[PDB]
């Protein structure tokens, strides 16, 4: 199988027609484990603004502004870290994928 360095993520990925959604498996303090959306080089995508559904605790990302377009679809690069520390090398890095849609 094609190797993946993704650690476990406490959530469920859904590639909708409208958007990308990540449903968290439980409610938690976003300040201490905070996601940011980055490009291929790891820089934060400043034009990306995601939404947090507070009822079901779901992250919502638009395809156009928060993903990297590739031939077969969309790469979704998410870095998650504790914002109360300066220590970034303890962050978790995830690379997810959504297939091309019409």
């Amino acid at each position, epitope marked *: 199988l094609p190797q993946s360095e993704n650690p476990a993520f406490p959530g469920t990925l859904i590639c909708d027609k409208d958007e990308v959604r990540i449903e968290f498996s439980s409610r938690f303090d976003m300040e201490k484990w905070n996601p940011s959306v980055v490009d291929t080089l790891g820089s934060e995508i400043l034009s990306c603004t995601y939404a947090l559904d507070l009822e079901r605790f779901v992250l919502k990302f638009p395809y156009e502004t928060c993903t990297i377009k590739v031939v077969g679809g969309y790469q979704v690069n998410i870095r998650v870290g504790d914002t109360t520390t300066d220590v970034r*090398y303890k962050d978790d890095m995830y690379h997810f994928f959504c297939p091309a849609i019409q």
Partner: antibody
């Protein structure tokens, strides 16, 4: 005043294991990371892993998975690295370094190094 | 794969006392944290028989006691260490390192010489 004191040089046979130590002073032992770094003669610096003595969390360079094991003792403020299944490629100088969490974990203080030679 | 690669250059350099020189470090990943507006890159100096010495952190902030003739600059993926008015005591091997991503990684080093 921040000081890291490593144990003395080691000379061992292939196949064995060694446990080297790093005693820290001058700062709150449980507040910072402790990194370990490998330097083969003439081949620069290679990061092995870190341990956080506050809760014994560890993170390893996957190249050293199963090769290095990090432990910490709060009472003596001492971090230990155990290298197993020693080979000639493990002969190197090993440094401990404080990861100063106030400044993002930068390695601002180093031990003097522990030379480890493996020969049959 | 996926590790941040630090490409340092040149591998060795020979200069006369008093001149100014620059060492280059290129990162395969961006090292800039939007959270605190800092580049997670450090510069180290290592003399024979000694442990590495931290010269610079946050890519441009000198450690206390480090002479102001060491100048770290750059951002994103491109960084430089400049020594203005090189001195005999500056002869050493210099390493760049990123501490933004795990595993932490070093450049291959630049050995600084005279003549």
């Amino acid at each position: 005043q921040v000081q890291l004191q490593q144990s003395g040089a080691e000379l061992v046979k292939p196949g064995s294991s060694v446990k080297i130590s790093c005693k820290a002073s001058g700062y709150t032992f449980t507040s910072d990371d402790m990194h370990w770094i490998k330097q083969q003669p003439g081949n620069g610096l290679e990061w092995i892993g870190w341990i956080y003595p506050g809760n014994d969390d560890t993170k390893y360079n996957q190249k050293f998975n199963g090769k290095a094991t990090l432990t910490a003792d709060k009472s003596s403020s001492t971090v230990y690295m155990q290298l197993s299944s020693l080979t000639s490629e493990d002969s190197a100088v090993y440094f401990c370094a404080r990861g100063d969490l106030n400044y993002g974990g930068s390695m601002d203080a180093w031990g003097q190094g522990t030379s480890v030679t493996v020969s049959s | 794969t996926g590790d941040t690669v630090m490409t340092q250059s040149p591998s060795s350099l020979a200069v006369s006392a008093g001149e100014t020189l620059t060492i280059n470090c290129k990162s395969s990943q961006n090292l800039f944290s939007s959270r605190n507006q800092k580049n997670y890159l450090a510069w180290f100096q290592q003399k024979p028989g000694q442990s590495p010495t931290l010269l610079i952190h946050w890519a441009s902030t000198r450690q206390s006691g480090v002479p102001d003739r060491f100048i770290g600059s750059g951002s994103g993926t491109d960084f430089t260490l400049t020594i203005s008015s090189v001195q005999a005591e500056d002869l050493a091997i210099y390493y760049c390192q990123q501490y933004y991503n795990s595993p932490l990684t070093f450049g291959s080093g630049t050995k600084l010489e005279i003549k």
